[PDB]
Design a protein around this ligand. Sequence first.
Ligand code: HEM
Length: 153
Amino acid sequence: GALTESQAALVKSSWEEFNANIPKHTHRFFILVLEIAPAAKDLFSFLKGTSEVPQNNPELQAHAGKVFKLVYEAAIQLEVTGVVVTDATLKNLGSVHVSKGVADAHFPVVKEAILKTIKEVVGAKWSEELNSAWTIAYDELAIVIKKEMDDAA
Ligand code: HEM
């Protein structure tokens, strides 16, 4: 709907399971990115000039771990305040994405790689409600990001 408390619980819950195996889950996210849009590889500094996604890279792990953390925090924020607040960081994030060649048409790619990751993290605990909670948070965070991008360009 607009993030109920049982929806926020599920995001936090699946988020903690994700965090439990960063090496594994973060490698798996970039696999799902590249399965969707193989052309995206080149945008990523730690993937460029590599054949396969690295499995024990600290840069990949740090990046993909931050990404998930910000969707999960966006979802708590929506639950609690009703909105996503734009701060310096999301302003900062807009200029970096503009610097790296990210367009609005790229957002659906990372959104589906994140849904598929989480589905594999929770396994049998997956529900259509968890799915809609991550969807809402991602979508609300991208809208903020996208305008900070559109203001940087
Ligand atoms: C809400 C959705 C997204 C979130 C929360 C987000 C978050 C981030 C963050 C936190 C970083 C590192 C920022 C820094 O400290 O420099 C970053 C970098 C990056 N992101 Fe995203 N991102 C999102 C969507 C996307 C999309 C759709 C793409 C395009 C395929 C993308 C591509 C990149 C690239 C190319 C970098 C630079 C990382 C590097 O090359 O080292 N992002 N993103």
